[PDB]
Design a protein around this nucleic acid. Structure first.
Ligand SMILES: [Mg+2]
Ligand SMILES: [Mg+2]
Ligand SMILES: [Mg+2]
Ligand SMILES: [Mg+2]
Ligand SMILES: [Mg+2]
Ligand SMILES: [Mg+2]
Ligand SMILES: [Mg+2]
Ligand SMILES: [Mg+2]
Ligand SMILES: [Mg+2]
Ligand SMILES: [Mg+2]
Ligand SMILES: [Mg+2]
Ligand SMILES: [Mg+2]
Ligand SMILES: [Mg+2]
Ligand SMILES: [Mg+2]
Ligand SMILES: [Mg+2]
Ligand SMILES: [Mg+2]
Ligand SMILES: [Mg+2]
Ligand SMILES: [Mg+2]
Ligand SMILES: [Mg+2]
Ligand SMILES: [Mg+2]
Ligand SMILES: [Mg+2]
Ligand SMILES: [Mg+2]
Ligand SMILES: [Mg+2]
Ligand SMILES: [Mg+2]
Ligand SMILES: [Mg+2]
Ligand SMILES: [Mg+2]
Ligand SMILES: [Mg+2]
Ligand SMILES: [Mg+2]
Ligand SMILES: [Mg+2]
Ligand SMILES: [Mg+2]
Ligand SMILES: [Mg+2]
Ligand SMILES: [Mg+2]
Ligand SMILES: [Mg+2]
Ligand SMILES: [Mg+2]
Ligand SMILES: [Mg+2]
Ligand SMILES: [Mg+2]
Ligand SMILES: [Mg+2]
Ligand SMILES: [Mg+2]
Ligand SMILES: [Mg+2]
Ligand SMILES: [Mg+2]
Ligand SMILES: [Mg+2]
Ligand SMILES: [Mg+2]
Ligand SMILES: [Mg+2]
Ligand SMILES: [Mg+2]
Ligand SMILES: [Mg+2]
Ligand SMILES: [Mg+2]
Ligand SMILES: [Mg+2]
Ligand SMILES: [Mg+2]
Ligand SMILES: [Mg+2]
Ligand SMILES: [Mg+2]
Ligand SMILES: [Mg+2]
Ligand SMILES: [Mg+2]
Ligand SMILES: [Mg+2]
Ligand SMILES: [Mg+2]
Ligand SMILES: [Mg+2]
Ligand SMILES: [Mg+2]
Ligand SMILES: [Mg+2]
Ligand SMILES: [Mg+2]
Ligand SMILES: [Mg+2]
Lengths: 103, 62, 77, 46, 94
RNA sequence: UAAGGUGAUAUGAACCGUUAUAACCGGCGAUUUCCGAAUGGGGAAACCCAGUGUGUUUCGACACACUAUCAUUAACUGAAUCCAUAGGUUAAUGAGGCGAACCGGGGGAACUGAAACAUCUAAGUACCCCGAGGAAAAGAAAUCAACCGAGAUUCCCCCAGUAGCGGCGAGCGAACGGGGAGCAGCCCAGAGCCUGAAUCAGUGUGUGUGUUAGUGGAAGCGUCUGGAAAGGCGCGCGAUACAGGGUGACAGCCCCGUACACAAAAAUGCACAUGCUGUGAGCUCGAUGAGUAGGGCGGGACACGUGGUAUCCUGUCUGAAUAUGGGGGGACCAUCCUCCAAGGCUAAAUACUCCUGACUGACCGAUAGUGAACCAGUACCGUGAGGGAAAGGCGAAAAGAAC
RNA sequence: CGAAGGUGUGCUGUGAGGCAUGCUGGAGGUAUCAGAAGUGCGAAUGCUGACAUAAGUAACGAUAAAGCGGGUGAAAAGCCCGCUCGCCGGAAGACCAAGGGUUCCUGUCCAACGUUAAUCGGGGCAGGGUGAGUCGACCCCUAAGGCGAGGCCGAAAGGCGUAGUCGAUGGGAAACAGGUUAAUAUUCCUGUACUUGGUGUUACUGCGAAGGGGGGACGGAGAAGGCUAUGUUGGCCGGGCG
RNA sequence: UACGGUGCUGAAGCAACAAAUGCCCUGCUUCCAGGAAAAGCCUCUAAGCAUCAGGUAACAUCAAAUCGUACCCCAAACCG
């Protein structure tokens, strides 16, 4: 009964990227998502002779709270909250605005 | 494999259990050396032996 | 154990009171004696560690009634 | 000097061991107290 | 007859060592890590059946586990059993 | 129920799965090493050694089941000793051990107080032992009362710190009666007559109601500051939902939830209804619990310390009448009243919390609160019983510092 | 647009105190009027933690004793190699039981430990290492003693104890020499043996016990005699001629 | 020759004397304080078995499991 899922396109509600969009890459069990291209940090990656890493300042994606994102409604161009309904005896998602089924 | 193994005899399940146990031995010696590079096969085999022993206690004496 | 088999008497505890009412704990033991009772029906003797009250009971009720009570109680004789 | 602890496992287990505690009534009360307190090593016995 | 399932659960691993390589090349004796409850007859039957090879004699010993410290928490490794399996002459094994 | 998973420190590796046998939750099942009541014998717990039987054998040997004790019952057997009995053996059923408090019983202190102390108190307390249940115990008048009457037991408030008891000291301390919670009465000592009729127990079935997984669940944007808005300033909307928690600062409208509405293949509780088995119902005529009541001696309990001391219990010695009779009414007698001992059963109101769920707090906030917020009954100490700690916080996020 | 808390300053009240504000801090605090208190600490040879003092003082654990060269290394009085010196030698050598429980060996490290340094270590980390028919235990047997079916006794618990069953420190079968590993060896290897049980043939034919008997099976002291271990000398062999 | 080692080869290997607190000796002598038990082992028969079972004698074959074994042990590793 998770509202925000993996291949969903979301917008960012709070944080240093308030308004940016992206796709979820994976959802974490702690109530966090990794959205492709948003919460970038620069980790000082240490070289390892095994694994063949030269070691540098790698910029990569950090997790973010599910509360801080919402599913982008591409029709209206905005964020909508997500409800659940049964269609054909099958639990589907829909937008709280316009009562449209999330696909 | 519970549906497949349910459609078998007692002697066929006992034969499969003995072939599983031979595969489990060959995997255990292979992972004893550094040769085995698929560690999940030990778990798959250990579950399938448990499924066979379960169906044997179901088909015989039950 | 100082227990009458017939009446179930048992050493009870009390006090020696002196003239100055000094109380020390004592015991009151039953006057138990082992006695062979002739059972006429079975034509044999039965030894019972019995008090003298129980011997008066056997003299009044009869030994067959008492050994019936001891079997219904579940007591060996 | 000769000190008061001269160890011997046989005498340790015959005197303070598990079956020596379980033999008597009061020894069983010792194991019941240590289980209620939650001792890791319930007795001497290895 | 010892059952084949037990014979499959007796042997754990080969033991690699300088002493194992020496006994293997000189005395033709392999060194195996075996199950702890395994006896000498179960080992001789297992090597004679699962490898199809002729065992002359089996010597066993129990290896006591070491006491290690992960961080500062104490711990103890498992006791395991070690078998010197002397093969007959001419026999060969990978 | 599901799009994400393979418990944690603790990554990684190798994999699984994405519309349904991935995972997760629940029900019923399966497996369930060894020790331990431990139960095949032993034993310095987690080990040693067997026996019998049925199976396999590539004759090397393997696997499985059973074998404790006691009680009761049945069968067989069986001494001195003729029968017999004791004893023996088989078989069946049951028990055993653990566990927080509450309960009933068997035993049972002392310090202390008395400004000493011995009677007394502490106190039938602490402690030990035995047994039981979800509660136990008690319980259906040989009771009170006072010439009016009440009508089993248990519990609460009064009566009343009264009456009394008491080196009449220290102290102990009712009852009658009244107001309440809760209420329920029955059976055998025995024959018949009508015969299965009430009720209860067990076992089924059906319905309802729970419980053990769960489902849906409303409504917000702009701007300023700021690292970050949930804050400020505007303008809206929901509310049977402004309980609570989280989210980068304080969020009814971001999330989880909440109000409300529902939901169970399976197991199971509780109600009814009813089936079956067993059980007897009712009427008549009877019967009416003997080494017992009482007594003597020695103790104990009753508020009552032997006192003028009733009543209750009994270790000892005795010892009645028995319905035309007997007990009690606080020495005792007489009158009167009241009840019927020496056989039993019985729900509720009552006591407690190892444990589970929900919620609450003018309870603590890391020298506090559990000894223990943290791998704590741990480290450590002790032969041992036993004693027994210290120790919380980077940041929003490791972005935990490449070079 | 910076709370509590901390640290200063200024002002104010008769006092306990109060107010404002600078810096730090980075999220809570709370008027008034009432209410309830785990409500105020300098002392209790108070309790717990931290830090002083004496003081860089005493001491650095047997008065068996050290010196030098070379090596390694960031660094050497302490480590390694070497040559000398000294000490024990009925022990300060070697082997075990009890007890401990990996302290054994190898590689690596020097923070802590080591009464100094440490490259070293019984220290840390990783790996390796203990091989049995004959050794020992287990096992057969019992002693003192323990437990104890039944049993006897006892308020209860329980006490004692029969048949039994445990219980060594004692009785009971058998393996020696040489070699080898960084670390095991009467355990491995080479050689040469030995014991007790089995099944199976062959010859022979009285077998049989929980019973009977024998044996096991037993003290102290003393005296020699016969030996061996072992040692000395000679011979022998190899080397030497200072 | 990795200077650690590893491989090959190998003489003589006798006698006398002294000699134990060790062995014969669980002996011998002597004394009084008068010096474990049981099994293994040997043997005797009892019921039983009757030409089978079992017994010993040789030979063959099989088995001998399990646990301990490192290291200190007078000591820096045990009790202090
Ligand atoms: Mg959010
Ligand atoms: Mg008293
Ligand atoms: Mg061994
Ligand atoms: Mg996991
Ligand atoms: Mg057993
Ligand atoms: Mg036992
Ligand atoms: Mg007193
Ligand atoms: Mg006193
Ligand atoms: Mg006093
Ligand atoms: Mg009751
Ligand atoms: Mg009246
Ligand atoms: Mg939901
Ligand atoms: Mg919602
Ligand atoms: Mg903040
Ligand atoms: Mg009556
Ligand atoms: Mg009376
Ligand atoms: Mg009287
Ligand atoms: Mg009396
Ligand atoms: Mg009398
Ligand atoms: Mg009376
Ligand atoms: Mg009167
Ligand atoms: Mg009655
Ligand atoms: Mg604090
Ligand atoms: Mg605390
Ligand atoms: Mg500031
Ligand atoms: Mg301040
Ligand atoms: Mg401040
Ligand atoms: Mg506060
Ligand atoms: Mg105070
Ligand atoms: Mg003061
Ligand atoms: Mg102080
Ligand atoms: Mg100083
Ligand atoms: Mg000075
Ligand atoms: Mg000086
Ligand atoms: Mg000095
Ligand atoms: Mg020194
Ligand atoms: Mg030097
Ligand atoms: Mg020196
Ligand atoms: Mg030197
Ligand atoms: Mg010298
Ligand atoms: Mg000397
Ligand atoms: Mg270590
Ligand atoms: Mg060393
Ligand atoms: Mg240094
Ligand atoms: Mg140092
Ligand atoms: Mg070390
Ligand atoms: Mg033996
Ligand atoms: Mg024995
Ligand atoms: Mg004995
Ligand atoms: Mg008994
Ligand atoms: Mg005894
Ligand atoms: Mg011994
Ligand atoms: Mg060595
Ligand atoms: Mg004999
Ligand atoms: Mg002697
Ligand atoms: Mg000689
Ligand atoms: Mg010269
Ligand atoms: Mg050794
Ligand atoms: Mg030494």
């Amino acid at each position: 009964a998770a509202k925000i899922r993996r291949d969903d396109e979301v917008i960012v509600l709070t944080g240093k990227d308030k308004g940016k969009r992206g796709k979820v890459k994976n959802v974490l069990s702690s109530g966090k998502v990794i959205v492709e291209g948003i919460n970038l940090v620069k980790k000082h990656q240490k070289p390892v002779p095994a694994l063949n890493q030269p070691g540098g300042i790698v910029e990569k994606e950090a997790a973010i709270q599910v509360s801080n994102v919402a599913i982008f409604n591409a029709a209206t161009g905005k964020a909508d909250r997500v409800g659940f309904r049964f269609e054909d005896g099958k639990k589907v998602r829909f937008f709280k605005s316009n009562s449209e089924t999330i696909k | 494999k519970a549906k497949e193994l349910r459609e078998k005899s007692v002697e066929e399940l006992n034969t499969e259990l003995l072939n599983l146990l031979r595969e489990q031995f060959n995997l255990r010696m292979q992972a004893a050396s550094g040769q085995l590079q698929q560690s999940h096969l030990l778990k798959q085999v250990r579950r399938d032996v448990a499924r066979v022993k379960t169906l044997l206690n179901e088909k015989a004496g039950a | 154990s100082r227990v009458c088999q017939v009446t179930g008497k048992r050493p009870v505890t009390g006090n020696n009171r002196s003239h100055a009412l000094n109380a020390t704990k004592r015991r009151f033991l039953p006057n138990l004696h082992s006695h062979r009772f002739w059972v006429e029906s079975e034509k044999r003797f039965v030894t019972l560690r019995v008090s003298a009250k129980g011997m008066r009971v056997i003299d009044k009720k009869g030994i067959d009634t008492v050994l019936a009570e001891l079997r219904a109680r579940g007591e060996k004789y | 000097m000769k000190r008061t602890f001269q160890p011997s496992v046989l005498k340790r287990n015959r005197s303070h061991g598990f079956r020596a505690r379980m033999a008597t009534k009061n020894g069983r009360q010792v194991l019941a107290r240590r289980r209620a307190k939650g001792r890791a090593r319930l007795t001497v016995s290895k | 007859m010892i059952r084949e399932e037990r014979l499959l659960k007796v042997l754990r691993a080969p033991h690699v060592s300088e002493k194992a390589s020496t006994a293997m090349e000189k005395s033709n004796t392999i060194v195996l890590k075996v199950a702890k409850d395994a006896t000498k007859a179960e080992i001789k039957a297992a090597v004679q059946k699962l490898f199809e090879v002729e065992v002359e004699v089996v010597n066993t010993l129990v290896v006591k586990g070491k006491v290690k410290r992960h961080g500062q928490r104490i711990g103890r490794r498992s006791d395991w059993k070690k078998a010197y399996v002397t093969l007959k002459e001419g026999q060969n094994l990978d």
